[PDB]
């Protein structure tokens, strides 16, 4: 097997989880230790269903920028035995565009799903259902509901978490390594 498929299948295997909150199904990315990230609008409660079992959330941190604008990412710390494979090395130090990126979705309804989004490019401000959002990026692919939390990647580098769309374009919250320090 080639390398870009291996990396994506490895992600699926040890870092990308099927989850359910009171808001529906999402893809969850485990980053390291007991630390994971979800789209802010998944609104994780005191517990979250992960794959096959209810897992308690010890702490949740919705990220905003330095003038307090939404970044659309929640950092959750899980009460689990498992430590995630530390993938913080694959996350750039600053938000990074990409070409020929792939969106990795993993949900009960959309399991192990690989979506050839295009090049990924910058955006900044997004109006997502009345929530103004910064540090977002864009890909000209018609993503759809149920794909939030999906992992944007290209060439072994984890760069965004899918958060929204419009039927012709998809938008992710950019990832940077300092979020997970
Ligand atoms: C991802 C998750 C999903 O389907 O779930 C259920 C959705 C619940 C409602 C909340 O999710 C919306 C949201 C995101 C961030 C902050 C607040 C709310 C989100 N909203 C949208 O994507 C909407 N689009 C826009 O507002 C918009 C602005 C610009 C510019 O372009 N689009 C909505 C589609 C009108 C949401 O539903 N995200 C959802 C994935 C998208 C559904 C449609 N295509 C997607 O990629």
UniProtKB/TrEMBL annotation:
Query: Where does this protein reside within or beyond the cell?
Result: Host cytoplasmic vesicle membrane; Host nucleus; Virion
Which intervals hold domain Peptidase C3? 2-180
What organism is listed for this UniProt entry? Human enterovirus 71 (EV71)
Subunit structure of this chain's protein: Interacts with protein 3CD. Homohexamer; forms a hexameric ring structure with 6-fold symmetry characteristic of AAA+ ATPases. Interacts (via N-terminus) with host RTN3 (via reticulon domain); this interaction is important for viral replication. Interacts with capsid protein VP3; this interaction may be important for virion morphogenesis.
Reported function: Protein 3AB: Localizes the viral replication complex to the surface of membranous vesicles. Together with protein 3CD binds the Cis-Active RNA Element (CRE) which is involved in RNA synthesis initiation. Acts as a cofactor to stimulate the activity of 3D polymerase, maybe through a nucleid acid chaperone activity.
> What protein name applies here?
Genome polyprotein
For this chain, the family text in UniProt reads: Belongs to the picornaviruses polyprotein family.
Parent-protein start and end of this portion: 1549 to 1728 of 2193
User: Source organism lineage?
Assistant: Viruses, Riboviria, Orthornavirae, Pisuviricota, Pisoniviricetes
């Amino acid at each position: 097997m080639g390398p870009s498929l291996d990396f994506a299948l490895s992600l699926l295997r040890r870092n990308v989880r099927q989850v359910q909150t009171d808001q529906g199904h999402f893809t969850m990315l485990g980053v390291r230790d007991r630390l994971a990230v979800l789209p802010r609008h998944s609104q994780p409660g005191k517990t979250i269903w992960i794959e096959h079992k209810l897992v308690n959330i010890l702490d949740a941190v919705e990220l905003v920028d330095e003038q307090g604008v939404n970044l659309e990412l929640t950092l959750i710390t899980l009460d689990t035995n498992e430590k995630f494979r530390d993938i913080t090395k694959f996350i750039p130090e600053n938000i990074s565009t990409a070409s020929d990126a792939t969106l990795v979705i993993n949900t009960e309804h959309m399991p192990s799903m690989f979506v050839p989004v295009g090049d990924v490019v910058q955006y900044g401000f997004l109006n997502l259902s009345g929530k103004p959002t910064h540090r977002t990026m864009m890909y000209n692919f018609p993503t759809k509901a149920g794909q939030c939390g999906g992992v944007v990647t290209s060439v072994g580098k984890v760069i965004g978490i899918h958060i929204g769309g419009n039927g012709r374009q998809g938008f992710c919250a950019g990832l940077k390594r300092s979020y997970f320090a």
